[PDB]
Symmetry: C2
Amino acid sequence: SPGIWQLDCTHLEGKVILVAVHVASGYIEAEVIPAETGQETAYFLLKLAGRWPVKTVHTDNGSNFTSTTVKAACWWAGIKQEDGIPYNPQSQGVIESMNKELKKIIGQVRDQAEHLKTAVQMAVFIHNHKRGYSAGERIVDIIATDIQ
Amino acid sequence: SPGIWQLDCTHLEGKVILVAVHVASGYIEAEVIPAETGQETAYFLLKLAGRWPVKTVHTDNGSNFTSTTVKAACWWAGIKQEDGIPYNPQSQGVIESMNKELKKIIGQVRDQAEHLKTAVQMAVFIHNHKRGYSAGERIVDIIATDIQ
Ligand SMILES: CC(C)C[C@H](CNC(=O)Cc1cc[nH]c1)Cc1ccc2c(c1C(=O)O)OCO2
Ligand SMILES: CC(C)C[C@H](CNC(=O)Cc1cc[nH]c1)Cc1ccc2c(c1C(=O)O)OCO2
Ligand SMILES: [Cl-]
Ligand SMILES: [Cl-]
């Protein structure tokens, strides 16, 4: 559980926002990319796994699950690649709600930045800091407990 | 101490590698940029502060310390901007040694990736995972102890 992440791809302003969610805490990292390709997803995962102890990733779709480049990155970084099928259906709704929430925050900051990528990083900040603990606090506590 | 980071700019292959070091743990995040501008440094800091609880940043040089865009990002993210003057001179040698170490790792992986940015993220991964605890383990424990 401390090492489980879920990928999530959402769209805004004709661009793609790729999100990784730490399932147990709700903590996220995100980036704007021109389109979801295997190469972009693979690079995003390499970044994520260098920053947090990523053991398992539930991939967001079958193309990324199949991608040889995504598979290469998961091999390189020691990540177990799994499907993202919500066997528990409350999983879908949780991600859906998060995408709506993230888009809301993006709208609230959009005018403070010229570029979407900046607004997305502002949204990541607000999401991870929002309080009762924050997602940032929860992920650190979960991983620290696991290390001990 | 749990919230203190230091910026570090190093060069390779005609490109710029911007690094943030969590001083107490040795944990890093890094990116490749075409050149070190206020705008790039500001964006990097916004990303960092959304991901870790960044209280204080020792900026890497006077141009970034002065930059209105860097100041705007620090204001936005609640970061206290400080100079990076090594009043304690062992600070300079520590960063120097880390840049040499990072470049060594980059050379060891360079052939496994087409692009420098990829090699840098591989280097971040290896640096943060290297063991006795790793830098990734130390930063999590430090912040968790602080939260409690
Ligand atoms: C920290 C926030 C409050 C401001 C900065 C600077 N932006 C402005 O002042 C433009 C402006 C906004 C309203 N009127 C004029 C945002 C920023 C920082 C770094 C970047 C950016 C951006 C961006 O604008 O997307 O793009 C890539 O690197
Ligand atoms: C996970 C590692 C082991 C491989 C991947 C895929 N690269 C190759 O297979 C090319 C190759 C290298 C040697 N011979 C053929 C690296 C990678 C992933 C994602 C990216 C990249 C790169 C990159 O190559 O820089 O660039 C931006 O998005
Ligand atoms: Cl790690
Ligand atoms: Cl945080």
